[PDB]
């Protein structure tokens, strides 16, 4: 049993809810929250900007030190950093950004990072301002992630469409 409430079950291991991932993290304090990161860990907008704002910029301060030491992530890659006030850990995962012309086949590689964690709270990757089709992102998630993932989708309108189109 876990703390996640109000989710629709899509598969054995994937659950979905219309929720603000920031407000969901604040309530649950999950072991892992996933950030929709870029390779520079520059948390300006989208899910990353919202998570970082909720940490009072501490996420960005920590991220800048990580990049100064290690250099940029790979598209499809990830790193584990603090979850600050939101979670124990934040898994920063880089999905391909269609608005930068990145290979959408890298979305499966991105979701494979989730398999290193038994339970996660996560946004659909590459969706929103990353320009991928969220329906596609949910299909790759279900077909890739084998650990237990709780998806918090921001838009009530994109949410209802994801449920009603899910195969
Ligand atoms: O609600 C979602 O699933 C979602 C929103 C979003 C943004 Cl704005 C940027 C990157 C990934 C994202 N996922």
Contact 151, 15 (CB under 8 A): yes
Question: Whole-angstrom Cα distance, residue 52 to residue 50?
Answer: 5
Q: Which are the contacts of 121, defined by CB distance < 8 A and separation ≥ 6?
A: 4, 21, 24, 25, 28, 30, 32, 33, 34, 87, 150, 152
Ligand 1: atom nearest CA of 137 is 3
Question: Whole-angstrom Cα distance, residue 58 to residue 67?
Answer: 14
Question: Whole-angstrom Cα distance, residue 32 to residue 142?
Answer: 18
| Residues belonging to the chain | 167
- Residue 31 three-state SS: coil
3-state secondary structure 75-111: CCCEEEEECCCCCCEEEEECCCCHHHCCCCCHHHHHH
Helix axes 46-54, 58-70, angle to 10 degrees: 120
Q: Which are the contacts of 96, defined by CB distance < 8 A and separation ≥ 6?
A: 75, 76, 102, 103, 104, 106, 107, 110, 126, 130, 132
Contact 92, 37 (CB under 8 A): yes
**Dihedral, CA of residue 148, residue 108, residue 113 and residue 124, to nearest 10:** -60
Q: What are the φ and ψ backbone dihedral angles of 41, each rounded to 5 degrees?
A: 50, 45
CA of 91 to the centre of ligand 1 (A): 15
Pocket residue to mutate for ligand 1, from 18, 20, 47, 149, most atoms within 8 A of Cβ: 47
Nearest to residue 37, comparing CAs of 104, 116, 122? 122
Kindly list the distances between the CA atom of residue 27 and the CA atoms of 9, 22, 55, 124, in Å, as whole numbers in the listed order.
Answer: 20, 9, 14, 19
Domain encompassing residue 78: 1-167
In this structure, the strands spanning 78-82 and 89-93 are antiparallel
Contact 21, 27 (CB under 8 A): no
Ligand 1-lining residues (CB < 6 angstroms): 36, 46-47, 123-124, 127-130, 153-154
Q: What are the φ and ψ backbone dihedral angles of 80, each rounded to 5 degrees?
A: -100, 120
What experiment produced this structure? Answer: X-ray
Contact 18, 159 (CB under 8 A): yes
**Count of domains for the chain:** 1
Residue nearest to atom 6 of ligand 1 (CA): 128
Contact 110, 145 (CB under 8 A): no
Helix axes 46-54, 21-28, angle to 10 degrees: 40
């Amino acid at each position: 049993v876990n703390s996640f409430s109000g989710y629709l079950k899509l598969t054995d291991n994937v659950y979905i809810k219309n929720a603000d991932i920031v407000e969901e993290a604040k309530k649950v304090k999950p072991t892992v929250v996933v950030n929709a990161a870029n390779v520079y860990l520059k948390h300006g907008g989208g899910v990353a900007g919202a998570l970082n704002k909720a940490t009072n910029n501490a996420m960005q301060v920590e991220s800048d030190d990580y990049i100064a030491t290690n250099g940029p992530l790979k598209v499809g890659g990830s790193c584990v950093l603090s979850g600050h006030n939101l979670a124990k850990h934040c898994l920063h995962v880089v999905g391909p950004n269609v608005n930068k012309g990145e290979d959408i086949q890298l979305l499966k590689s991105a979701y494979e990072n989730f398999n290193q964690h038994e339970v996660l709270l996560a946004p659909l990757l590459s969706a929103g301002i990353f320009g991928a089709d969220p329906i596609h992102s949910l299909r790759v998630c279900v077909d890739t992630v084998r650990t237990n993932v709780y998806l918090a989708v921001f838009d009530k309108n994109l949410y209802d469409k994801l449920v009603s189109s899910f195969l």
